[PDB]
Design a protein around this nucleic acid. Sequence first.
RNA 1: UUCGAUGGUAGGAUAGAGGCCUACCAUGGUUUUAACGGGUAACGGGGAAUUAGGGUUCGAUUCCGGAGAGGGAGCCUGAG
RNA 2: GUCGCUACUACCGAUUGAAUGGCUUAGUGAGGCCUCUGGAUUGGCAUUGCCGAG
RNA 3: CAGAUCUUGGUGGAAGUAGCAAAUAUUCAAAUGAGAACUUUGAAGACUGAAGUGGGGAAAGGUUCCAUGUGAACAGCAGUU
RNA 4: GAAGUCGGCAAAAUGGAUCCGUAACUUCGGGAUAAGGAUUGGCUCUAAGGGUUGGACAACCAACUUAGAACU
RNA 5: GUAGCCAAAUGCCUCGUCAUCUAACUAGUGACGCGCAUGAAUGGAUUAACGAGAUUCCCACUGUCCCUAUCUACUAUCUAG
RNA 6: CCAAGCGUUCAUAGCGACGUUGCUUUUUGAUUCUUCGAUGUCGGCUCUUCCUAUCAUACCGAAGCAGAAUUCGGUAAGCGUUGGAUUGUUCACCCACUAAUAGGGAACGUGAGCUGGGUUUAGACCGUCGUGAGACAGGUUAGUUUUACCCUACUGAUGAAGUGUCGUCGCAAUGGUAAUUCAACUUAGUACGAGAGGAACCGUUGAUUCAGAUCAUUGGUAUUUGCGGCUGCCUGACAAGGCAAUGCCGCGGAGCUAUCAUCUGCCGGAUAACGGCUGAACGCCUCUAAGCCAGAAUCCGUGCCAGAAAGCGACGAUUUUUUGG
RNA 7: UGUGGAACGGGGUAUUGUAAGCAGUAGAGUAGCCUUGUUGUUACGAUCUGCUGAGAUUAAGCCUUUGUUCCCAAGAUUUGU
Lengths: 384, 134, 63
Amino acid sequence: KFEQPRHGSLGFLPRKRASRQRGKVKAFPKDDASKPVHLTAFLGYKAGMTHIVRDLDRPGSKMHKREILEAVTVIETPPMVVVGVVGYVETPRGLRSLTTVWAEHLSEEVKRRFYKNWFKSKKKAFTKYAKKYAESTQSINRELERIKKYCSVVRVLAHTQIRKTPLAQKKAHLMEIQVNGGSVADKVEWAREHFEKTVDIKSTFEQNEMIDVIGVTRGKGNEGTTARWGTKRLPRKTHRGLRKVACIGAWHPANVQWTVARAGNAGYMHRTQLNSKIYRIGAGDDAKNASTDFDATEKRITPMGGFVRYGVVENDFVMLNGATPGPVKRVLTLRKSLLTHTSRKALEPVSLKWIDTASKFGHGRFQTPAEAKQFLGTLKKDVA
Amino acid sequence: GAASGTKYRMTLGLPVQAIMNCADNSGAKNLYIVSVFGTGARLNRLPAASCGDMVLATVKKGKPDLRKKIMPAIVVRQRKAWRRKDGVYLYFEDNAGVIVNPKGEMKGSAITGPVAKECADLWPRIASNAGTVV
Amino acid sequence: MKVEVCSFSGSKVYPGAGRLFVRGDNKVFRFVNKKSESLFLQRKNPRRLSWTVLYRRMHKKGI
RNA sequence: UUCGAUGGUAGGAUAGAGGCCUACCAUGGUUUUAACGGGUAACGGGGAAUUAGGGUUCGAUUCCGGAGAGGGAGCCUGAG
RNA sequence: GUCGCUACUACCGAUUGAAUGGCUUAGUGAGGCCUCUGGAUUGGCAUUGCCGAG
RNA sequence: CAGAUCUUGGUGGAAGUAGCAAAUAUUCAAAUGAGAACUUUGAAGACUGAAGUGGGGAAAGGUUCCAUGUGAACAGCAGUU
RNA sequence: GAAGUCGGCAAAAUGGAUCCGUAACUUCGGGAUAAGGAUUGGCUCUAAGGGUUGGACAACCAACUUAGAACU
RNA sequence: GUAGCCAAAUGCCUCGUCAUCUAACUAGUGACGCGCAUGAAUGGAUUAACGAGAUUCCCACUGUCCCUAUCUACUAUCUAG
RNA sequence: CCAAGCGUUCAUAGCGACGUUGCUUUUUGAUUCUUCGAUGUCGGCUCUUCCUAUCAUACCGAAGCAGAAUUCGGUAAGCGUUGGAUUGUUCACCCACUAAUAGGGAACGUGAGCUGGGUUUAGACCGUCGUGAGACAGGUUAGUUUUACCCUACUGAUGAAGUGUCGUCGCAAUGGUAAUUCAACUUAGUACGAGAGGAACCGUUGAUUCAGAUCAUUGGUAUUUGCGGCUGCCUGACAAGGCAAUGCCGCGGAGCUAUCAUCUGCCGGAUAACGGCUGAACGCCUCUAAGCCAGAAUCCGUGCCAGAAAGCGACGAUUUUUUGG
RNA sequence: UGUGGAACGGGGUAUUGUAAGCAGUAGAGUAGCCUUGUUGUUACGAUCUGCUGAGAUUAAGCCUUUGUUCCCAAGAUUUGU
């Protein structure tokens, strides 16, 4: 007796390590042939977290027309490079890839993806493909026409520009992004003109848009049932430990059931968090990335001393509200929402009033080096 | 329940068996929290209250007439810090409450010490007898 | 968007920084961090602690 | 009798004497002739009532003295 | 005298008894006074810092 | 003889598994040696802290005492000790 | 702040010394360190409490305590 | 069954009746006694002090708990034997 | 099931005797078929799953102005069913909250999971009985809770290739799945209603429980032995250090972590009860016989988690003038 | 052998709280020495003040670096339609 809800959710099983790291899109948004051709996904890198202050526009709320403080996550999103197109035909056994067409020239970043030791390799990855592309230019057109004639789903191959990111990893992340819009012919044509071309973050997503964040969570290693499933700690008198489940099963069935909490892996799992609102899409070529209409100080989106364990964000970035799966510097997937949003919270425009740029390496109290200079005056090493 | 509308979530700091001070001139010196109104069902979880809650309490030290009986009370101060919606963490120097009726009208007439803003908005009768707010 | 001043160290307090303590004598104190709050609870004197702006103002540090 | 209760020395403060206060030195001072404590439904006296004498009761109240301006505490002006 | 029966008084009285006023216990402590600083301004010195009131 | 929780002897799976975690703590260089984490020397860092991990005895043991050599068995790792 | 648990199990809290103060009950011996309070460092001083010894005294040598004060 | 004593470590009925504490106790204590089946050196009653005896309550205090979290050393792990 | 009846008045609104037909039994009892070369034995804690004989939540029907309240009534077990004083207890009774504090099974679920409060017969006291040793439709006190390193199950972690090799990007058969409830306000003083009174669809703002993440802020943690402070001893003194099994104290970045902090948590089809349409049978009527809609928190899907290690697809390069191909 | 890596150094960001040394009579005061001072020298003295927002640490899971010095142009195994 004394009923209580079960510990944990059976939908997130098995609690094993994810087989991937990038984070894949399990379902792209439903295609519409009326809206123009556009992308449905993007890749970025989690630079860190900060907090903002903004006026809450929500009639009927207690804090209506009053400032609120909210935590946000910054994801660096430099433009991605489209290097290929993949067509999928709708078979009675699912979606099947028919053929893949690549660009004539591929960068070193994307070419590193096909190798474990690129430096020791002979750098022969698309040499014959480029030769076929330059020989007479009929096979590429034939394959593109095949994708146009057949196939119902078109996905472009795009890779991140990790070179202009402070990450030590030189290998770029490659991903298939489904192309939604009118007609397969326009999708293939759009891919063809975008070969060896960069797609920016603001062309894919816009301000106040609700998106989904897909990524692998922070690794936690092995963990007991107390922290893996949130079970009750056993009394202090418990012999042979107290951080376990007292009863893991009953007689008949003479087996341990799959619904009983057990110790094991507790982290590094694939997740997709829904309904993340875009608070700001900032560019990498302006000095007012973190400046608002109520704070005219020319400052960029970077804490004092740089982002902790990440560096300096000099590219385009997003300011999704709340938290996102995965640790800092992990690659995250941004996907268009599969649902329709009509609530006040979803449709409320966001106008930031202040963005914190103080150091996250401690109890920072200065937003900018100029503010630190004015407050502290002259120091011993400062004057001499 | 049904004080002036809705109150934002606040950090609970006054569970059952907590003895807080009495911040009115009803004649009671402390309030011993017996139960908290609005508490749901959860195994082993002790009901707890924040500022502006509508706990039931008994008088442990005070007038014998006020002792040995249950009475509604509203929590006005708590030691545990809670976060406002504007990202401000605040707390008081003591845990204090005031004896009220089920409708929320204070049995006393004057409130000594500051009163939390959330309690003031929720219960207008408390705000009238209160002095400074926050 | 206002910026407060710490009641102990005198440092500028941006929103979402430190804590707020309201005393029984209806006085409001804003502490920039736990160090300032702990020293206040320990009854340390800001005019005595060398790193506080009140000490610097009293002693005319920096001219 | 500590954080001054008894006396001595010195000093400070007071308009002035003074354990009024301060530092030191001795343990002293009152008391069954009632010290100390408690109640007073106690401001005190000239005086009033009863009237053999002796006594008993009262005095908030036209005069004298004391304290007070809800309760203590502190101070300026001013000879006060 | 006993029990039976009625109104009333006082004591003890568990309830670790409560509450009004005084005597203390430890901390905190407004305000005036004295005292150390303190220096908006004035103040004899185009001229300068010195007595300073403050 | 197939049994008797049979007798004696030998040998298995468990298995290169449980385990070899009380008593704070070792490090550098040199010598010997085929071989050095355990031998010796020097240096450094520590502990027992006089009711001691010090110096002696009673009972008990019986050569374990000393010198010179050995490293087959033991010193649950090693060994030049 | 015991709401845990059969049960304050375990842990925490108290703790030395000096100065105040200490109830019911009692076999008058105790209870009692009842309970309940305050102080404690460093430095510089002050006062008092004892030994032999050169012509009312006396320059040493050889000594440890107690109490108090200022400053920090 | 006298003096005493009691739902007592002794009462089945029983969670006896009344009072007290708690917001609430079948607990505890204080009273009552047709006491199944208390009782006077098979000792009755009371008793200061004492008790690593048993029971109830209060203050201080605290991860016992709300509700768990963090840190250190030795294991568990891997390796050589 | 039958209906004598009660139900100002109507046999079944609803109760409903006497009988009768059944289901269950966690009440002990009955027998002795298994176990005495050995199945650890109550309660409590923890944890998972299953049933409906449904307490609440969802949608319906029955009467009466409405609004409450009743049949919980018809489907429905998807999702919840609490905190305390007491009982060792099962049960049961009180204090409150809550939408509700519903009932059971799983060797009367769960001791190589815990505890040992019950039993716990060794020590000891009492009551009754016995001459006695000793006995109990009894009370009380103190009394060792062993072992997994084996197989399987479960939780996590590697892993060979004949079907070319090594990589990149993928599909998804299958298995699992998740959200839940409440308050206030606008509807609205509106429908209704002689009167007082008084809803509902929807929408908005919040909140409870649960689930998955994260560390911007706040709190906690200290071997950052990072900085500073303190005691005893030691290095002749200062300085700088060491020991005191982490010497102690204050702060303390980074990390971890908190329903002590923050973020997020959909809609499509098919239905159950039930309500209708065209419509016969049974020349009419009637949801049903054929057929068509509507319709529950129901079922299955979208989405979410894993990815068959013997399911599959597309793409890339193929031991270099030595050798292999 | 490359927008290569490493070890240091610098800068930034953070933690603590003002380093050692010198000087000052600031210092509660205490003893000697002198022409005898409204700054008398000298000796001891918890502490205080100024150089000093100083000093120390700062990746070990912080950021940055056109600074300095080195290093890598190797070895072994497997794999064929």
